[model samples]
Target: GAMGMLKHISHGDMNAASDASVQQVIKGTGIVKDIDMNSKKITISHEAIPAVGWPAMTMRFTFVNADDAINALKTGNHVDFSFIQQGNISLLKSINVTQS
Candidate 1:
């Protein structure tokens, strides 16, 4: 069987989900360490982003709102997500569950 299941982590959609200026949007794939929905935040242990010269880091992040997106996430789930970070302002844009 020459069949295989591989996720080519390629971001094919870039439809200005609102756009950004003084903020940098970085995408990362990582394991969900914790989810604090009460605080509108999540903690993840993600792969290193070389473009930003950041090593593999486990960080606690906040989101822009308390939407249903936060309702779908739970602890210990692998996720593909992007966030807006400007110094102390760490806002999780979106998080989707991904299997590995």
Candidate 2:
């Protein structure tokens, strides 16, 4: 009973496709497209995520430390990062500058 409840809370009643996409450990190397301080969003043009069969695309992600992280990032900087899905949001977990 407890385990089922925990599972429901953690993953919900997501479909197989959605579950696979979320469960996959998604990481990619890409260039910084934009960093919005006001919105606390980072736009990146990342490579395809083979783990989830995701194609290369430009997308925005919310960061943990909005101000600090946004201040540190610059456009055109190549980066490597990892992310996990929480609900409908693809939150950026960590990012590192791979090239200037």
Candidate 3:
């Protein structure tokens, strides 16, 4: 079993707080790889951030209403994102970068 490797590791029992925290960080958790102003999207890549499968991964976000955020961000910029699970997908609610 894949989960067997992590047997001894104590997986935090599912909790509202833990879930909320993870969801919040996952978006701002990415490393910007590239940007396309025309597309209003950013290319991000993050390593296995979590101890579990799919826990740590990289993805892109096409900001819906806050396209300005994407425009303001650039390659090599580190973003601390706050997100929440909306239905089945994790969506970014807010983010802050290293620069003010």
Candidate 4:
């Protein structure tokens, strides 16, 4: 009975760690491969992000109420952007487009 109670000792001092992980933010840099203004989604051929275990590939990131950000981008342009990772959803936060 005593040994059975010793499971998962990581509960102590892990509140802050768990709270921060509730909304993780990751940034990426890549070149735009496609842009759909109607859906406000940008497909980028981004470099590998080992932190999130994402290989270098084309990914589509969606924007919410970011008309200026969407309209300011175009295919074949370079972009440095960040997004929040939540349960298979990566919400767009900021996008900086390089001068074409």
lDDT of 2 by residue, 44-82 (tens): 888887875668998887787864545787898888887
TM-score, structure 3 vs. true: 0.47
The root-mean-square deviation over C-alpha atoms between each candidate and the true structure, in angstroms, is 13.1, 11.8, 13.4, 9.6
Please estimate how well model 1 matches the true structure, expressed as its whole-model Cα lDDT. 0.75
Write candidate 4's Cα lDDT for 17-49 as tens digits: 334455556888888888776777777888887
Prediction 2 TM-score vs. true:
0.66
Candidate 3 lDDT, 1-100, residue by residue in tens: 3554545768678755433444334434667777655665455665554532344466655444555666687788876665555665545566567467
Better of 2 and 3 by TM-score: 2
Model 2 clash pairs? none
- Model 3 residue runs over 4 Å out of place are 1-28, 35-41, 47-55
* Candidate 2 wrong stretches, greater than 4 Å: 1-25, 67-70
Consecutive 10-residue window with the lowest summed lDDT within model 3? 18-27
What is candidate 1's lDDT per residue for 12-64, written digit by digit as tens? 88765675585556777778888887776788888796755668898877877
Better of 1 and 3 by lDDT: 1
Full-model lDDT for every candidate: 0.75, 0.76, 0.57, 0.76
Q: Candidate 4 at 61: error in angstroms?
A: 0.5
